[PDB]
């Protein structure tokens, strides 16, 4: 039997850094090698892109490095650059081959079946998707058809305030009748409806 590995969903975002850890086991309980790479190019092949996705496996070659209750663990990380191409269809599917000490490898078998396992899906998302803006904050407006300028600026401050893990560089701008965009580092954006952040007193 070969190493036996354990991976999961590896979602990514442009603008981020990302870290996931892989698990590995081995009937030996040992695992001498860790190669993750794209499903081209044969036995020898340690061919990976994008070549921002990085990986590193700490204590390989030892004794009962790789068992049920302690799996070898390899490190897969990076940084998405903001120029990544975004759509439905900008994942990478890729495969984790571990070798124990006779040489067997684990085996690549192209079915989204073994996601999760040896294989697994990198998907790049857009900055937005990896953030989900609270929208508990309330300010109170003159008129809600016509914000001032101070108003806009309260609004986009309070969105701010409630908001502490969106990324500093990240720009809240309010519109005249309240709505907000928050415009991400790749450019991206989310909006937020003004009636979940402004009210007025015009209504009797
Ligand atoms: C032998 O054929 C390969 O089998 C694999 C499984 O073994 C994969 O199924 C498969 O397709 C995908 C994938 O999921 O990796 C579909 C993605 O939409 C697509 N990503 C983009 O286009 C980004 O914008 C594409 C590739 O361009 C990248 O992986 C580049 O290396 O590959 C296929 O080519
Ligand atoms: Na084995
Ligand atoms: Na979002």
Same mark, same amino acid.
């Given at each position: 039997?070969?190493?036996?590995?354990? #991976?999961?969903?590896?979602?990514?975002?442009?603008?981020? *850094?990302?870290?996931?850890?892989?698990?590995?086991?081995? /009937?030996?309980?040992?695992?001498?090698?860790?190669?993750?790479? /794209?499903?081209?190019?044969? &036995?020898?092949?340690?061919?990976?892109?994008?070549?921002?996705?990085?990986?590193?496996?700490?204590?390989?070659?030892?004794?009962?490095? &790789?068992?049920?209750?302690?799996?070898?663990?390899?490190?897969?990380?990076?940084?998405?650059?903001?120029?990544?191409?975004?759509?439905?269809?900008?994942?990478?599917?890729?495969?984790?081959?571990?070798?124990?000490? *006779?040489?067997?490898?684990?085996?690549?078998?192209?079915?989204? @079946?073994?996601?999760?396992?040896?294989?697994?899906?990198?998907?790049?998302? #857009?900055? @937005?998707?990896?953030?989900? =803006?609270?929208?508990?904050?309330?300010?109170? $407006? /003159?008129?809600?058809?016509?914000?001032?300028?101070?108003?806009?600026?309260?609004? &986009?401050?309070?969105?701010?305030? &409630?908001? =502490? /893990?969106?990324?500093?560089?990240?720009?809240?701008? $309010?519109?005249?009748?309240?709505?907000?965009?928050?415009?991400? =580092?790749?450019?991206?954006?989310?909006?937020?409806?003004?009636?979940?952040?402004?009210?007025?007193?015009?209504? *009797?």
């Amino acid at each position: 039997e070969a190493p036996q590995v354990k #991976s999961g969903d590896y979602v990514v975002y442009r603008g981020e *850094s990302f870290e996931y850890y892989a698990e590995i086991t081995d /009937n030996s309980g040992q695992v001498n090698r860790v190669v993750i790479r /794209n499903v081209e190019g044969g &036995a020898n092949s340690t061919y990976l892109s994008p070549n921002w996705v990085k990986y590193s496996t700490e204590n390989l070659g030892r004794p009962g490095n &790789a068992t049920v209750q302690n799996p070898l663990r390899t490190r897969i990380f990076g940084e998405v650059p903001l120029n990544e191409i975004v759509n439905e269809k900008s994942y990478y599917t890729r495969y984790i081959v571990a070798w124990d000490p *006779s040489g067997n490898a684990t085996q690549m078998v192209d079915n989204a @079946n073994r996601n999760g396992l040896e294989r697994f899906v990198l998907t790049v998302k #857009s900055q @937005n998707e990896k953030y989900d =803006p609270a929208e508990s904050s309330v300010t109170y $407006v /003159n008129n809600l058809s016509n914000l001032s300028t101070s108003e806009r600026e309260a609004v &986009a401050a309070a969105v701010r305030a &409630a908001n =502490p /893990n969106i990324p500093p560089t990240a720009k809240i701008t $309010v519109s005249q009748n309240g709505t907000v965009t928050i415009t991400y =580092p790749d450019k991206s954006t989310d909006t937020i409806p003004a009636n979940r952040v402004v009210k007025d007193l015009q209504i *009797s």
